Structure formats: structure tokens, C-alpha cells
Design a protein around this ligand. Structure first.
Ligand SMILES: Cn1cc(C#CCn2cnc3c(c(-c4cccc(C#N)c4)cn3CC(=O)Nc3ccncc3Cl)c2=O)cn1
Ligand SMILES: Cn1cc(C#CCn2cnc3c(c(-c4cccc(C#N)c4)cn3CC(=O)Nc3ccncc3Cl)c2=O)cn1
Ligand SMILES: [Cl-]
Ligand SMILES: [Cl-]
Ligand SMILES: [Cl-]
Ligand SMILES: [Cl-]
Lengths: 122, 122
């Protein structure tokens, strides 16, 4: 019965991305080979089965640094981190395989499914 | 040029509300007279000019407890906190004035404007 605000969730996500761009209340750095990316653990948990499983565990919840598998492509990771904070996925012929493999590792099914649709559409 | 995921922002907000319901990575309690409400500072900053102004200030960013004005109605506050995390506003004849005054204090213009529309619609 409540009044629905159709733009509200997008407004929240935009403001969370603005906080990330200023490093405000970021609480983790994700290390991907020679690169590092700061983020909010809450957003990572909201968007990734891997990060959900890491930070729900009381053993790991307070970690300030997460080292990803050294095989993960930093560009693929950055594309997916930007997707988490924007709802926009930068998929191209030159990055689809790295993005798809990274989304499998991060446990991000809708992106993996979208990568399969991209391949089927050539 | 990116692929747009129209449901993604709502999915993120739902998962942030699920984390709030489990008290996972909440980092502040908001005290409203005899009641207390836990939340994520990032979501509060994303949805309120008052909380943005409090937590952007390096003087106050690390506060774990915020005491609101003792005049603020706890039910009005709870309605607006739920709106922040759901995009749904529970506006009724019995709560409109308290919700509107609380939204003015929290600096939440779209809700204040919606309260004005509710009054104009009787
Ligand atoms: C090999 N492989 C495994 C998979 C997988 C997969 C499945 N999968 C699993 N977990 C996921 C997601 C998502 C999610 C969210 C938004 C966009 C996208 C995308 N794109 C994904 C969040 N999460 C964590 C969660 O559900 N968080 C949560 C749950 C309950 N309460 C609070 C919180 Cl935070 C997901 O897709 C793919 N390949
Ligand atoms: C007396 N009175 C003053 C006012 C006012 C008012 C105006 N107002 C001011 N600030 C606001 C909002 C919002 C906001 C967001 C979503 C829904 C609603 C509603 N409903 C409001 C966020 N915010 C903080 C911000 O803009 N955060 C942010 C900005 C830039 N980067 C990162 C971040 Cl987190 C707002 O409405 C009304 N009455
Ligand atoms: Cl971005
Ligand atoms: Cl390309
Ligand atoms: Cl709720
Ligand atoms: Cl009523």
C-alpha cells in the first residue's frame, strides 16, 4: 500500500558511487595482482556471492585487505566493480572472456548469463 | 554504450536492507528519544542531507552514536529509515504531519514534496 519511489534505488546507488569516488567510508581494498581497488564491503556483499561468503563469515568480516586469485584480470575486475556501483556493464569483444571468467569467480550470475547472451549474439 | 541492468539498483538496495535486518556491517545507532535504530552510515548519507552533513565532516565521521533532536517522533523516523532502504513510503492521515516534519529535519526533499502532494490530495 506504500507510495513507491521508482528512481530512489538508482539515486542511492549513484550516491554510494560518489562516496566511493571520494573514498568516504570505504572499508576494504581489493588487491588484484599489481592493482588495488577500494570499496564498501556492504556493496560488494550485495553484488557478489564471493564477497558475501567472505564478509558474512565472522572469521573474515573485519579484514581490511582481500587478495584475489593472482589469475584474475584487473581490467575485468574493475569493469565488474563499476557495474556493481552503476548498473552499467562495459562488455566488448576484447573484454568479454575476461569479464565472464571474473564474474564466475565473483559469483555474479546475471553478468555471467549476459556474457553468454553476448557470445550467442556474436 | 554500456548494457543497462534496470533491476540492479533495487537488487542492491534489497540486499543492503537484508544486511541491516541481520545487523551486518551496521556502523551507527541513531537514538530517537527512548528508541534506537541501527543503520549503515553510507545509506544514511545517500538519503539524507542531515546525515550527509554529519558524516562528511571529519570531526563526526567516526561517531558510533547520533542523538537526534528529542522532539523527533520515533515512528516518523522509523518510517523514513524504512523508506531509505526500500523506496516505499508508508504515508497515512495519522502519520503525515510527523513524517513531513521528520523529513524536513533529515533534509529529504522528495519525501517533503510528496507529503505536500498528499496534503493537496486530502
Ligand atoms: C561459478 N558461478 C557462480 C555464479 C553465481 C551466482 C549467484 N549469486 C550469488 N550470490 C550473489 C549474487 C549477487 C548479485 C547481485 C547483483 C548483481 C549480480 C550480478 N551479476 C549478482 C549477490 N550475491 C550475494 C548475495 O546474495 N548477498 C546477500 C544475500 C542475502 N542477504 C544479504 C546479502 Cl548482501 C549472485 O549472482 C556465477 N558463476
Ligand atoms: C528543510 N528541508 C531541507 C530539505 C532538503 C533537502 C535536500 N537533500 C539534501 N541532501 C540529500 C537529499 C538526499 C535524498 C536522497 C534520496 C531520497 C531523498 C528523499 N526524500 C533525499 C540525499 N542527500 C544527501 C546527498 O546528496 N548525499 C550525497 C551527495 C553527494 N555525494 C555523495 C552523497 Cl552520499 C536531499 O533531499 C527538505 N526540507
Ligand atoms: Cl563508476
Ligand atoms: Cl573490443
Ligand atoms: Cl524494511
Ligand atoms: Cl491513518
Amino acid at each position: 500500500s506504500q507510495i513507491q519511489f521508482t528512481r530512489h534505488a538508482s539515486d542511492v546507488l549513484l550516491n554510494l558511487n560518489r562516496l566511493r569516488s571520494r573514498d568516504i567510508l570505504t572499508d576494504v581494498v581489493i588487491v588484484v595482482s599489481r592493482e588495488q581497488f577500494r570499496a564498501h564491503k556492504t556493496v560488494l556483499m550485495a553484488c557478489s556471492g564471493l564477497f558475501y561468503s567472505i564478509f558474512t563469515d565472522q572469521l573474515k568480516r573485519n579484514l581490511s585487505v582481500i587478495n584475489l586469485d593472482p589469475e584474475i584480470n584487473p581490467e575485468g575486475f574493475n569493469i565488474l566493480l563499476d557495474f556493481m556501483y552503476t548498473s552499467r556493464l562495459n562488455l566488448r569483444e576484447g573484454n568479454i572472456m575476461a569479464v565472464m571468467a571474473t564474474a564466475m569467480y565473483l559469483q555474479m550470475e546475471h553478468v555471467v548469463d549476459t556474457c553468454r547472451k553476448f557470445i550467442k549474439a556474436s
